[PDB]
């Protein structure tokens, strides 16, 4: 059934699973027309498909041409997501296909279930966790490849950089969700924290800065402060 705080370590067992987040698939800017009406302009989006055990991220870029001439785009976006996730699974060798796909939004359950009818043994599950994957587009290198795309494209990343050499996947996922929660609550501050010290760089093949273990503890403490703050600045506490 649904994934929650109680069965959290299941994410890091040896059954292949993927999170799918669709919140950045259909993206628009809202603007005024010359007549003073309102209109939308689509911008490029992405499907965020993540193996939480390995850090492997399958970033399917959604180019704005896929919406041309289509109606009810927010509904179509869920079905397009499911189409692309199904195509990804079919592209993988059998031994790499997931045994479960966890969707971050319940509205993805029926579209993905219907697209995966060929795979009756792959479980499609919701979650009660409020995961911050919408903030993936606050990661500069991810945002950059999405905005530069001129055609549909799949780009593969490891969202944990080399962390698994030093920490477990449980700890890596916890760091990732802390970073992303911070970026979602106050992007400017979070990004300031991450880059304030210019002697710590992002390797060309990485997404995040090359912190030592001790600097990560400081960084992580700064992100918690940020999140509790904003939680005060917000509710006044």
């Amino acid at each position: 059934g649904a994934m929650n705080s109680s069965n959290y370590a299941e994410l890091f067992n040896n059954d292949i699973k993927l999170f799918v987040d669709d919140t950045n698939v259909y993206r628009v800017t809202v603007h005024k027309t010359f007549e003073g009406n309102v209109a939308t302009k689509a911008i490029n989006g992405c499907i965020f498909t993540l193996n939480p055990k390995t850090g492997h991220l399958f970033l399917k870029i959604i180019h704005t041409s896929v919406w041309a001439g289509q109606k009810r785009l927010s509904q179509l976006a869920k079905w397009k997501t499911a189409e692309e996730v199904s195509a990804l699974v079919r592209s993988l060798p059998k031994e790499e296909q997931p045994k479960q796909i966890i969707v971050t939004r319940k509205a993805m359950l029926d579209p993905l279930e219907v697209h995966m009818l060929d795979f009756p043994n792959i479980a499609i599950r919701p979650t009660e966790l409020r995961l911050p994957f919408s903030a993936a587009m606050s990661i500069d290198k991810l945002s950059d490849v999405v905005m530069k795309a001129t055609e549909p494209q799949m780009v593969l990343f490891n969202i944990y950089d080399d962390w698994l050499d030093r920490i477990s996947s449980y700890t890596a996922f916890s760091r990732l969700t802390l970073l992303l929660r911070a970026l979602k609550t106050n992007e400017e501050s979070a990004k300031m924290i991450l880059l304030s010290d210019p002697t710590i760089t992002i390797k060309s093949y990485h997404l995040w800065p090359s912190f030592t273990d001790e600097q990560w503890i400081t960084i992580e403490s700064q992100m918690r402060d940020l999140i509790l703050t904003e939680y005060g600045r917000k509710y006044n506490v």
Partner: protein
């Protein structure tokens, strides 16, 4: 006009015949039902006074043979049987009629209710749903599972209704996933009407049979089937115009006949609100929508 005689009534029982019912006391001198209209299927059904559990009964068509009821004290129920000796049967019935030991099928002449509930029901096609090899009549009771339900555990004494499943490969063409799920016209018209039923009369017959088993026996799988067959039509953007008009009439008379106090269990809120207010056919069921809104506005 045909007759279903009873050998006797050894146990106190409420007896139904179609939408009518009457109480018989233990060892009351009751010997059956006369003046049954020819041309329609019928159902004769039973609820014992001591065990309101298990309503049960028999679908039959008097044109297909001479049928009677006899209590079996070993199996503890009223059983339908066929009498092959036509002279023995005429003589039994004539004596019971002479002694006025029979209730009269009590049809008002203005009343088309039973016709309207059984217009497409066929008794030869109930050899698909309940193939109890030898029987010309068909036993149904409250607990009977569907054949489909054996897979989500006895299928020759079950309801072999047509398997409808909206998230199935049968319902969804590869490459048309979103289209076929949001508009079920290809599943309705190509898969079900052209491939399985053969015509809409057959589609309406199983839909009518499903409703009647839900109403008379509280058969839960029958209620599921009735709602699925409604929802498949309402969720299709493309439906023959004559089918929509006929469906409105079918459902109107079903909703009219439903006991007011059973609406809580026999009507699925989700299906009816979707069908009447969200679906492609939301504007196509005027008679049904009006009776539903005046009789069960709570459900909506």
């Amino acid at each position: 006009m045909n007759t279903v005689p009873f050998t006797s009534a050894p146990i106190e029982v409420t007896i139904g015949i179609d939408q009518y019912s009457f109480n018989v006391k233990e060892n009351q001198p009751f010997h059956g039902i006369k003046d049954i209209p020819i041309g329609h299927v019928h159902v004769i059904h039973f609820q014992h006074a001591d065990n309101s559990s298990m309503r049960y009964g028999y679908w039959f068509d008097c044109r297909m043979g001479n049928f009677y009821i006899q209590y079996d004290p070993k199996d503890g129920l009223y059983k339908m049987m066929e009498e092959r000796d036509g002279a023995k049967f005429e003589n039994i019935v004539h004596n019971f009629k002479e002694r006025q030991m029979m209730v009269s099928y009590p049809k008002i002449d203005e009343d088309d209710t039973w016709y309207n509930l059984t217009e497409f029901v066929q008794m030869d096609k109930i050899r698909k749903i309940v193939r109890k090899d030898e029987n010309q009549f068909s036993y149904v009771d409250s607990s009977m599972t569907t054949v489909q339900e054996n897979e989500l555990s006895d299928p020759a004494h079950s309801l072999n209704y047509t398997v409808i499943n909206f998230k199935s490969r049968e319902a969804i063409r590869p490459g048309h996933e979103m289209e076929d799920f949001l508009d079920k016209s290809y599943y309705l018209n190509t898969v079900m009407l052209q491939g399985i039923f053969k015509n809409s009369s057959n589609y309406f017959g199983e839909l009518q049979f499903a409703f009647l088993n839900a109403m008379f026996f509280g058969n839960y799988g029958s209620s599921l089937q009735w709602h699925a067959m409604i929802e498949l039509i309402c969720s299709s953007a493309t439906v023959p115009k004559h089918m929509l008009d006929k469906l409105d009439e079918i459902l109107y008379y079903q909703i009219k006949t439903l006991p007011e106090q059973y609406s809580d269990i026999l009507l699925n809120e989700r299906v009816w609100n979707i069908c009447l207010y969200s679906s492609f056919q939301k504007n196509s069921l005027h008679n049904t929508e009006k009776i539903m809104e005046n009789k069960y506005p709570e459900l909506l």
